[PDB]
Amino acid sequence: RVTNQLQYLHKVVMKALWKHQFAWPFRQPVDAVKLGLPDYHKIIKQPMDMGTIKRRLENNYYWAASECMQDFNTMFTNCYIYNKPTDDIVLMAQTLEKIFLQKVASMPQEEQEL
Numbered sequence: 001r002v003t004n005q006l007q008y009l010h011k012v013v014m015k016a017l018w019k020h021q022f023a024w025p026f027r028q029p030v031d032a033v034k035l036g037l038p039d040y041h042k043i044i045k046q047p048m049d050m051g052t053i054k055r056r057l058e059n060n061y062y063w064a065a066s067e068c069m070q071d072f073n074t075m076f077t078n079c080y081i082y083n084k085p086t087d088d089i090v091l092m093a094q095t096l097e098k099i100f101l102q103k104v105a106s107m108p109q110e111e112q113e114l
């Protein structure tokens with residue numbers, strides 16, 4: 001499916017998040033071997049990242065805007081659940097999610113499939 005809403009999520013929301021200076025740790029899946037986190041996949045059952053979301057948007061994977069929004073949500077939530085309250089990554093996530101919500105507050109309201 002291809003809608004006004006999904007185009008907004010791609011051209012406005014993803015565009016803003018992807019180039020952000022705090023975005024780099026979220027542009028690809030968490031690599032638990034590289035980062036030395038043997039329990040990552042024990043704790044986080046549904047990994048998600050902006051590279052995956054971007055690919056899905058580019059390939060018309062999503063059928064509704066809410067679906068894409070849930071993937072953004074999962075990505076941020078995984079981060080808050082896995083990491084320590086004091087970890088810098090949490091601050092970076094909060095910053096990006098603030099922008100996510102600000103942009104989503106202005107997304108087109110009715111899913112005009114095109």
Ligand SMILES: Cc1noc(C)c1-c1cc(-c2c(C)noc2C)c2cccnc2c1
Nearest residue numbers: 002003004005006007008011108112113114
């Ligand atoms: C301008 C213009 N004049 O004719 C058309 C067609 C567009 C257009 C429409 C959408 C569009 C579509 C398709 N659905 O909602 C919107 C907005 C776009 C989306 C992203 C980028 N460029 C877009 C350009």
Ligand SMILES: Cc1noc(C)c1-c1cc(-c2c(C)noc2C)c2cccnc2c1
Nearest residue numbers: 024025026030031035078079082083088089
């Ligand atoms: C996202 C995410 N969710 O859980 C963790 C853990 C991350 C993370 C954290 C760091 C990170 C940063 C930034 N500083 O310390 C660590 C660890 C990264 C660094 C490079 C690449 N990917 C990284 C991914």
